[PDB]
Design an enzyme around this catalytic site. Structure first.
Site, PDB file in Angstrom:
ATOM      1  N   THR A  53       1.371  -1.269  -0.632  1.00  0.00           N
ATOM      2  CA  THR A  53      -0.159   0.025   0.549  1.00  0.00           C
ATOM      3  C   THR A  53       1.382   1.609   0.129  1.00  0.00           C
ATOM      4  O   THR A  53       2.027   1.737   0.262  1.00  0.00           O
ATOM      5  CB  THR A  53      -0.753   0.272   1.479  1.00  0.00           C
ATOM      6  OG1 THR A  53      -1.656  -0.892   1.069  1.00  0.00           O
ATOM      7  CG2 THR A  53      -1.954   1.543   0.867  1.00  0.00           C
TER       8      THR A  53
HETATM    9 CL   LIG Z   1       1.089  -0.516   4.610  1.00  0.00          CL
END
Ligand SMILES: [Cl-]
Ligand SMILES: [Cl-]
Ligand SMILES: [Cl-]
Ligand SMILES: [Cl-]
Ligand SMILES: [Cl-]
Ligand SMILES: [Cl-]
Ligand SMILES: [Cl-]
Ligand SMILES: [Cl-]
Ligand SMILES: [Cl-]
Ligand SMILES: [Cl-]
Ligand SMILES: [Cl-]
Ligand SMILES: [Cl-]
Ligand SMILES: [Cl-]
Ligand SMILES: [Cl-]
Ligand SMILES: [Cl-]
Ligand SMILES: [Cl-]
Ligand SMILES: [Cl-]
Ligand SMILES: [Cl-]
Ligand SMILES: [K+]
Ligand SMILES: [K+]
Ligand SMILES: [Mg+2]
Ligand SMILES: [Mg+2]
EC number: 3.4.25.1
Lengths: 220, 238, 4, 238, 203, 233, 240, 204, 230, 4
Positions: free
Chosen positions: E1
């Site tokens: 992410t």
């Molecule tokens: Cl993360």
């Protein structure tokens, strides 16, 4: 286990294999992994078997309560919330990996739900030890707005991929087709594996087993 | 029987010989102590609530004198009856609705919110240690399938959906007016005409409050003084 | 414990 | 007019009174008298000790709370001890946490909070004791008064108990002199006020007077029996 | 992410990649990590998917009820505070790295970081998630005071494209959102729309 | 009907005032404190010749240095006595010293007013204790006698009577008592006074006597030792 | 009427007499007033002096409940102080949870529901107090709310509680407070207290004054001694 | 391993209008045999039996606590419990101990008390139920038992052929497991009768 | 906490008058009817629907508990809602354990047991409702009544609410054991007509039926049809 | 487990 789901033009198609294992032995050859949640919502289960059985039953039951009260058809977001909030509470100790699919007043919806309580809302999902096999089929062949028979082919192809490439998966393919107008619970959809034919006769004649003790207890 | 009494059946919520609950009956009388009347009506396109706004003082900040409350963005209510009781019942309704949205992932339907408040009120009719709330709640909102909705619950724990209804001092006269009008085969104009008839007042824009929800605009909206005046002037010029 |  | 409103501390009367509180206050009015007064530098307590019989020792009326605080009691002894123990604990907590004396006004606030609680809950009762509280802190000497009603008062001087109105009158007469008094004068004044509460026959003696003193150079100290003799003689009056 | 948010005069820009991983399998390629908490307040989520979803649902509930009670739009600083309180109190039981960003009439466009551990700090711009390591330099060199909205969107898409290139744990599509008084504008940069930078093949 | 914590208009707790009235129904007990020790004397009040007199126990040992004489509803006294015993042993455990008479009395007296019907943890006390107590003993302050009643008020007393005939007995105690009185004189005095006020003819079976002295531990008088003292009559 | 022993019992006319009786305790108390104006809120209290032995400042009926909020009380003082503690805790918790100063309306609505909860049960009695809450900030402006023993809360331009409530109101109504500053209103608060004071029935009172406005930078504070005394003198000479 | 501590094996097997349930008789503690007549199969009704292999203490506790629940059910309802309903009852009991389970894996064999239809199932130790139309096995020699059952079982067997098959599957399975055996007991459940036999069997 | 003492007690003559008085509330309620046909059960009830202003479909007196069990009542409506909710909740608890729908008699027993609690538990009054409970299981219909005491009875046919005693004698001279469901629905509606006053539409009576297919409310258009004849 |  291989379980899977797809959003098609008019609804959801869910799929599952029918093997259950105790270690690296098959305990059940024809176990049912697509669970009733409400008349318009079903849920495939993978992971700890008791946990998927008791988790789907409890939520189905609470939704029956809910819909009894509201006089309305239940929503997929409600099933999703109830499941995820419970699973989150238990911190992953309830080993239930779920593919939740149904149709409500806002149309077809499909979620995957993980033991720790995360969910993903997607047009196709797979779960279980055979999920990468099943997912490879989906990435290769899924198109949006498939017709019913296309979607059913694709899901059964995805389950087959799991069945044949994952030692965790096997036996039959079950489908469930859910639309605004229809619910088809297709158990079995396909029986790609058949037990081989018994070659020798072992005709154990009466008296073969020696007996020490006998008691007959008649009934009425 | 016929108004009979044994023991403490006038003090707590136990049955009288006739099987009445005098304490519940008395909670209804407490609704009228406020001296106010409220009216609600629904059509195919919208639901409206109108109530009196008495500001006898002028040292009051009149913006804080209201009986209209937002429950969610799409559910409004008018309260009638004892004020603090009413405010408590509004807080509870807000909590129930918010909590519903958190658990179930969609907004509470108006009928369910009314039912939940009614069910809570019922507990006060069966348990001896607290009194009923001396107030009456009318809810409005749009339902996706059923259209605009008006619901009312009371201190007995009865609730119902209505084409139109009323609460408070001139409730019976408002009911009569609305019945006579609805017997045949404009929703905001009916509500304020009903209220003006039963009171015989013929209003200024600062003497009433109006709240609406519409199929087009389901967010609960309280009308301004100017917006109310438009309806008052349109009615005055038949 | 049986698994799926 | 009275009898149904006077047994429960949760029952308001129709004149907006709580008879159980008022009755609790009689407990202090019938206790023996005590006087509290202060100067710029010291807070003194003076108390009459009731002897049940000739051979009884006289009831303790003055109690150590902390180095900087002591109290005089009037009312139910057992309630006096419970409250004194509460005060002792709040003073220890403050020294444990902050390594400095609990300020007297803050202690008194805690008494108020604490003692109010049972005046509002069914089946509980007021504390049947009033206190005069002598203290010294960063803001100088203090005399506070606490009541069964949970109210409290910051005083230049005060008297409570039987015939304390006489002592109050003396204290009013001479209060303008108090702030600039040395310690001996200030006690002399306290003793004179206390002496007004006595039947004209009766005198202050070493058997019946108890004295408590705190100030700028002096921890709270209690004088009884032979230790009061220096303060009595003394003996202005007539 | 990888997640990111940038303040401009009048609003904020938020961005995230779309990758969810278990080990090195990608459970979701088109994840939506920018979740609405109110009309004009978003959070960007990194860390545990279960944790950040549960926390975000709980704050949404808290803030929605708060907002009806006050009968006013919520402050961005209040959304951030609620995130902070829950992330700090449950720091030993949560794995969540959050950016809260939005607009309110009082303080305008704001970005708050609530990293793991549950501190809260307001920033001109914020980055978080595994992939953010690979863009500290870039954003330190590129960020200019006074950037317009369109500049903030470009800056955000560039930074995320770079992180996504290098971080195995980031990838997929770039999701952007701009939040201002006038509302919320969402979009997806996918395929050829994602900013491209040559692999440095040999002369 | 009213709660157990109701104040009367005169500023007293009805239950405590009524509990004090129960003390007047108990047998007379006498305590005298001298410089050579304290003595405790109590009327047994035998109700039948079939009752075993030694099975009436109205003076009890708290610890080696402390006795207790009681009057009123005797069954109520048991939990108070047990609390006094347990406290003295706790004090010994924690501090390695004897607890003072005053401190024991104070501990017991803090149980007074702990009744009520809506704070109430277990089924806790519903009413006060219908008992008055004389604690007599010896500590570093010397020989000592304390009185305690159902109010929770306690106080040191040079001499004190409690029970039915205590006004009368107390009157006779102011007469006979002096500071420089011996213990053996105080013993005689209290029997003289018990003889006056008892409904029954006093003898060695229907009273109890106990002493505590600087030198000697708590000591209950035997039948033989009572008879010796009774001779002077 | 009958019927009046428990806050869990309605009378046949639909009244809760125990709450009505609590209100009577407030209306027996001496008068407190609050006035909202252009740039803040001012409070004044007629503080009756029951002894010359009490210290100047004893039995305050004005409280700081947050740094930006003042509380002005009438009624049974111990109940009011307890309510001040509840208010304080509500403001404290609000800041800890939501990370900014509690808005006055919200604090008023929260404390009011607490007051309201004591109007339903045989287990507890209603509070015998009414109180005003006042604040100022640049974003929310001046605000003045009042809560009574039933738990009703409303916002006011001007307000009075206690025994000369109606007399106070008719004097307050003569002020154009919307166009006036706090520095002006103190004098008018002091004036009104002196008008409604019954100097024959109850001699000797202290005037207690507090404010919160622009001039205090949104902090609730006591009016300074020199300003109070100017207001006292203005009120005194206005009467003769 | 907890499940190998006492050893043991049970199976059940379906026929034409009949069922069979069987069990070894050994009670041992690791290598040591203590007793050779230990009960593992318990009546739950005239035509309904539960067989429990696993930790011996929990074999007994589950049997006893299930009985508690069953007797209450039957007094309260009108009737004898159905096979499927007994399974759900056992399932519920074991899943209560989800996070500290009983160490037993039951098998149920019976006839429906109205229809007399054959029923068999097994459950894992946290109550996952598993109904089959052929056979179920449970215990330390489950693989041995699966081998025998998969090779010998046929559909529609009568009481005499069902007895021979279950007996041969048990005896030969347990003869390959050190900690199961010391005897085998077999119950054949018919509409009109219960036939209970102990088999001639290896005692090593 | 609440009041911990009972509010129903025995009077000197051995009656529990708070239950008798709850029965009076039932007797003053709107009429309800239940008829057990050979192949099904019918429940019918009058709506005390005054005003044309009421939305008649907005609350129902005839409610489903499960797919196979249904309720109606006479007495206080809000009390009834409490028991509908408990009944439903009880039906699910049973289903979760046994994986079989709760038998009608078992549901009735558990609901009756809750009603008994409110005649003895601290600080509450009894429910002022009687329930009629219909269901189909073991291939057979069931009709049950449960009263405010927590007593329950199995009926072939009965009536409750205003004018019930006449209703019972109307059915006493009109039900046979061999009666079909569609006939039973006709006589159920005629039983309500005996004690009506007002003229019947489909909007002011409510009818539920219970058979092998499960329990459901009749729709306004179905009731309209039966009301042609009556 | 499953992360972003
Ligand atoms: Cl993360
Ligand atoms: Cl969701
Ligand atoms: Cl799996
Ligand atoms: Cl005293
Ligand atoms: Cl006392
Ligand atoms: Cl006072
Ligand atoms: Cl006094
Ligand atoms: Cl990706
Ligand atoms: Cl996510
Ligand atoms: Cl929410
Ligand atoms: Cl972080
Ligand atoms: Cl982060
Ligand atoms: Cl006595
Ligand atoms: Cl058990
Ligand atoms: Cl069970
Ligand atoms: Cl109680
Ligand atoms: Cl329900
Ligand atoms: Cl239905
Ligand atoms: K009640
Ligand atoms: K990548
Ligand atoms: Mg975790
Ligand atoms: Mg073997």
């Amino acid at each position: 286990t291989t379980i899977a789901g797809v959003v098609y033009k008019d609804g959801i198609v869910l799929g599952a294999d029918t093997r259950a294992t105790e270690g690296m032995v098959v305990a059940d050859k024809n176990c049912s992994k697509i669970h009733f949640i409400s008349p318009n919502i079903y849920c495939c289960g993978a992971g700890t078997a008791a946990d998927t059985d008791m988790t789907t039953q409890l939520i189905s039951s609470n939704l029956e309560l809910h819909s009894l009260s509201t006089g309305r058809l239940p929503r997929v977001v409600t099933a999703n919330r109830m499941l995820k909030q419970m699973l989150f509470r238990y911190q992953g100790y309830i080993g239930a990996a779920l593919v939740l699919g149904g149709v409500d007043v806002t149309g077809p919806h499909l979620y995957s739900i993980y033991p720790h309580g995360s969910t993903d809302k997607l047009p196709y999902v797979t779960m279980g030890s055979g999920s990468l096999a099943a997912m490879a089929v989906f990435e290769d062949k899924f198109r949006p707005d498939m017709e019913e028979e296309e979607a059913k082919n694709l899901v059964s192809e995805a389950i087959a991929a799991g069945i044949f490439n994952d030692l965790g998966s096997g036996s039959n393919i079950d489908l469930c087709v859910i639309s605004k107008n229809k619910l088809d619970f297709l158990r079995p959809y396909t029986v790609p594996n058949k037990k081989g034919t018994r070659l020798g006769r072992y005709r154990c004649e009466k008296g073969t087993t020696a007996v020490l003790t006998e008691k007959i207890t008649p009934l009425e | 029987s016929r108004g009979s009494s044994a023991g403490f059946d006038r003090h707590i919520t136990i049955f009288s010989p006739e099987g009445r609950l005098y304490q519940v009956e008395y909670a209804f009388k407490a609704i009228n102590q406020g001296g106010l009347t409220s009216v609600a009506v629904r059509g195919k396109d919208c639901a409206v609530i109108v109530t009196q706004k008495k500001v006898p003082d002028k040292l009051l900040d009149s913006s804080t004198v209201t009986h209209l409350f937002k429950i969610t963005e799409n559910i409004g209510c008018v309260m009638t009856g004892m004020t603090a009781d009413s405010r408590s019942q509004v807080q509870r309704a807000r909590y129930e609705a918010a909590n519903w949205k958190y658990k179930y992932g969609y907004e509470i339907p108006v009928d369910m919110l009314c039912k939940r408040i009614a069910d809570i009120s019922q507990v006060y009719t069966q348990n001896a240690e607290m009194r009923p709330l001396g107030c009456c709640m009318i809810l409005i909102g749009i339902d996706e399938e059923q259209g605009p909705q008006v619901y009312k619950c009371d201190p007995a724990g009865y609730y119902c959906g209505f084409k139109a209804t009323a609460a408070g001092v001139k409730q019976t006269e408002s009911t009569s007016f609305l019945e006579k009008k609805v017997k045949k085969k404009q929703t905001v104009e009916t509500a304020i005409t009903c209220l003006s008839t039963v009171l015989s007042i013929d209003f200024k824009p600062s003497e009433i409050e109006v709240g609406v929800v519409t199929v087009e605009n389901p967010k609960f909206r309280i009308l301004t003084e100017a917006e109310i005046d438009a309806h008052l002037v349109a009615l005055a010029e038949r | 414990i049986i698994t799926x | 007019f009275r009898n149904q409103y006077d047994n429960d501390v949760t029952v308001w009367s129709p004149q907006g009174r709580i008879h159980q509180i008022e009755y609790a206050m009689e407990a202090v009015k019938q206790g023996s008298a005590t006087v509290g007064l202060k100067s710029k530098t010291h807070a003194v307590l003076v108390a009459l000790k009731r002897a049940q019989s000739e051979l009884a020792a006289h009831q303790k009326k003055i109690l150590h709370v902390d180095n900087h605080i002591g109290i005089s009691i009037a009312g139910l002894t057992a309630d006096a001890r419970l409250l004194c123990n509460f005060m002792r604990q709040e003073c220890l907590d403050s020294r444990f946490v902050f390594d400095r004396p609990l300020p007297v006004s803050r202690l008194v606030s805690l008494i108020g909070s604490k003692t109010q609680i049972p005046t509002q809950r069914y089946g509980r009762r007021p504390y049947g004791v009033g206190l005069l509280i002598a203290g010294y802190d960063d803001m100088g000497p203090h005399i506070f008064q606490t009541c069964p009603s949970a109210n409290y008062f910051d005083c230049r001087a005060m008297s409570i108990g039987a015939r304390s109105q006489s002592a109050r009158t003396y204290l009013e007469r001479h209060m303008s002199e108090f702030m600039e008094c040395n310690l001996n004068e200030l006690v002399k004044h306290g003793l004179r006020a206390l002496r007004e509460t006595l039947p004209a026959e009766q005198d202050l003696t070493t058997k019946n007077v108890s004295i408590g003193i705190v100030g700028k150079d002096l921890e709270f100290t209690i004088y009884d029996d032979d230790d009061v003799s220096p303060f009595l003689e003394g003996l202005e009056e007539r | 992410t990888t997640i990111m948010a940038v303040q401009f005069d009048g609003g904020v820009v938020l961005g995230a990649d779309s990758r969810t991983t278990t080990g090195s399998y990608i459970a979701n390629r088109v994840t939506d990590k920018l979740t609405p908490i109110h009309d004009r307040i978003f959070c960007c989520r990194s860390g545990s998917a279960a944790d950040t979803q549960a926390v975000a649902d709980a704050v949404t509930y808290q803030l929605g009820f708060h907002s009806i009670e006050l009968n006013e739009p919520p402050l961005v600083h209040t959304a951030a505070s609620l995130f902070k309180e829950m992330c700090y109190r449950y720091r030993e039981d949560l794995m969540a790295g959050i950016i809260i960003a939005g607009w309110d009439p009082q303080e305008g466009g704001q970005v708050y970081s609530v990293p793991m551990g549950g501190m809260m700090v307001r920033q001109s711009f914020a980055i978080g998630g595994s992939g953010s390591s690979y863009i500290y330099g870039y954003v330190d060199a590129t960020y200019r005071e006074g950037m317009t909205k369109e500049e903030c969107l470009q800056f955000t898409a560039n930074a995320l494209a770079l992180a996504m290139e290098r971080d195995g744990s980031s990838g997929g599509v770039i999701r952007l959102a701009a939040i201002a008084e006038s509302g919320v504008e969402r979009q997806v940069l996918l395929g050829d729309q994602i900013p491209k930078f040559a692999v440095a093949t040999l002369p | 009907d009213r709660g157990v914590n109701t104040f009367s208009p005169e500023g007293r707790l009805f239950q405590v005032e009524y509990a004090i009235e129960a003390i007047k129904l108990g047998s007379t007990a006498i305590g005298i404190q001298t410089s050579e020790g304290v003595c405790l004397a109590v009327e047994k009040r035998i109700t039948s010749p079939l009752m075993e007199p030694s099975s009436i126990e109205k003076i009890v040992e708290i610890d080696a240095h402390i006795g207790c004489a009681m009057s009123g509803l005797i069954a109520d006294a048991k939990t108070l006595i047990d609390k006094a015993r347990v406290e003295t042993q706790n004090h010994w455990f924690t501090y390695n010293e004897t607890m003072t008479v005053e401190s024991v009395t104070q501990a017991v007296s803090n149980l007074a007013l702990q009744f009520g019907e809506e704070d109430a943890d277990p089924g806790a006390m519903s009413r006060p204790f219908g008992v008055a107590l004389l604690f007599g003993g010896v500590d570093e302050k010397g020989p000592q006698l304390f009185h305690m009643d159902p109010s929770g008020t306690f106080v040191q007393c040079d001499a004190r009577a409690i029970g039915s005939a205590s006004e009368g007995a107390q009157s006779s105690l102011q007469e006979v008592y002096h500071k420089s009185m011996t213990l053996k004189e105080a013993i005689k005095s209290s029997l003289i006074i018990l003889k006056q006020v008892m409904e029954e003819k006093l003898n060695a079976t229907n009273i109890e006597l106990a002493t505590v002295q600087p030198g000697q531990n708590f000591h209950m008088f035997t039948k033989e030792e009572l008879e010796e003292v009774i001779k002077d009559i | 009427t009958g019927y009046d022993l428990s806050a869990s019992t309605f009378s046949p006319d639909g009244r809760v007499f125990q709450v009505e009786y609590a209100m009577k305790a407030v209306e027996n108390s001496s008068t407190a007033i609050g006035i909202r104006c252009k740039d803040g809120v001012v409070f004044g209290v007629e503080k009756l002096v029951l002894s010359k032995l009490y210290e100047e400042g004893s039995n305050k009926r004005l409280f700081n409940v947050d740094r930006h909020v003042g509380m002005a009380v009438a009624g049974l003082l111990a109940d009011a102080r307890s309510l001040a503690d509840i208010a304080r805790e509500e403001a404290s918790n609000f800041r800890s949870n939501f990370g900014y100063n509690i808005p006055l309306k919200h604090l008023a609505d929260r404390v009011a529901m607490y007051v309201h909860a004591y109007t339903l049960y045989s287990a507890v009695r209603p509070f015998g107090c009414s109180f005003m809450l006042g604040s100022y900030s640049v974003n929310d402006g001046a605000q003045l709310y009042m809560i009574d023993p039933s738990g009703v809360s409303y916002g006011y331009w001007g307000c009075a509680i206690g025994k000369a409530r109606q007399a106070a109101k008719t004097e307050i109504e003569k002020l154009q407070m919307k166009e006036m500053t706090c520095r002006d209103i103190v004098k008018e608060v002091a004036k009104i207290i002196y008008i409604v004071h019954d100097e024959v029935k109850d001699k000797a009172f202290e005037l207690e004054l507090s404010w919160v406005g622009e001039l205090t930078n949104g902090r609730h504070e006591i009016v300074p001694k020199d300003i109070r005394e100017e207001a006292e003198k203005y009120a005194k000479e206005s009467l003769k | 391993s907890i499940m190998s501590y006492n050893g043991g094996a049970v199976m059940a097997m379906k026929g034409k209008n009949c069922v069979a349930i069987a069990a070894d008789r050994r009670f041992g503690i690791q290598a040591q045999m203590v007793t050779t007549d230990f009960q593992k199969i318990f009546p739950m009704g005239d035509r309904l039996y539960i067989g429990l292999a696993g930790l011996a203490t929990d074999v007994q506790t589950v049997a006893q606590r299930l009985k508690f629940r069953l007797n209450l059910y039957e007094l309260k309802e009108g009737r004898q419990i159905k096979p499927y309903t007994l399974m759900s009852m056992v399932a519920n009991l074991l899943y209560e101990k989800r996070f500290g389970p009983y160490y037993t894996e039951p098998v149920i064999a019976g006839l429906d008390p109205k229809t007399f239809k054959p029923f068999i199932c097994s459950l894992d130790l946290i109550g996952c139920p598993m109904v089959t139309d052929d056979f179920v096995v449970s215990g330390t020699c489950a693989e041995q038992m699966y081998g025998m059952c998969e090779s010998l079982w046929e559909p529609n067997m009568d009481p005499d052929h069902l007895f021979e098959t279950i007996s041969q599957a048990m005896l030969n399975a347990v003869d390959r497991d050190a900690v199961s055996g010391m005897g085998v007991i077999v119950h054949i459940i018919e509409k009109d009768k219960i036939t209970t036999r102990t088999l001639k069997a290896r005692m090593d | 906490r609440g009041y911990s003492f009972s509010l129903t007690t025995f009077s000197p003559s051995g009656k529990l008058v708070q239950i008798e008085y709850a029965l009076a509330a039932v007797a003053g309620g709107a009429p309800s009817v239940g008829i057990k046909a050979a192949n099904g059960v019918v429940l019918a009830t009058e709506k005390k629907q005054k005003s044309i202003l009421y939305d008649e479909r907005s609350v129902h007196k005839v409610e489903p508990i499960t797919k196979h069990i249904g309720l109606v009542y006479s007495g206080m409506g809000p009390d009834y809602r409490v028991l509908v909710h408990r009944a439903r909740k009880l039906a699910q608890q049973y289903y979760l354990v046994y994986q079989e729908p709760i038998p009608t008699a078992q549901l009735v027993q558990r609901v009756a047991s809750v009603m008994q609690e409110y005649t003895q538990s601290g600080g509450v009054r009894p429910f002022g409702v009687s329930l009629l409970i219909c269901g189909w299981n073991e291939g057979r219909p069931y009709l049950f009544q449960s009263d405010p005491s927590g007593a329950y009875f199995a009926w072939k046919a009965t009536a409750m609410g205003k004018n019930y005693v006449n209703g019972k004698t109307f059915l006493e001279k009109r039900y046979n054991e061999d009666l079909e469901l569609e006939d039973a629905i006709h006589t159920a509606i005629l039983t309500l007509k005996e004690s009506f006053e007002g003229q019947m539409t489909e909007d002011n009576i409510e009818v539920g039926i219970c058979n092998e297919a499960g329990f459901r409310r009749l729709t306004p258009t179905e009731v309209k049809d039966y009301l042609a004849a009556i």
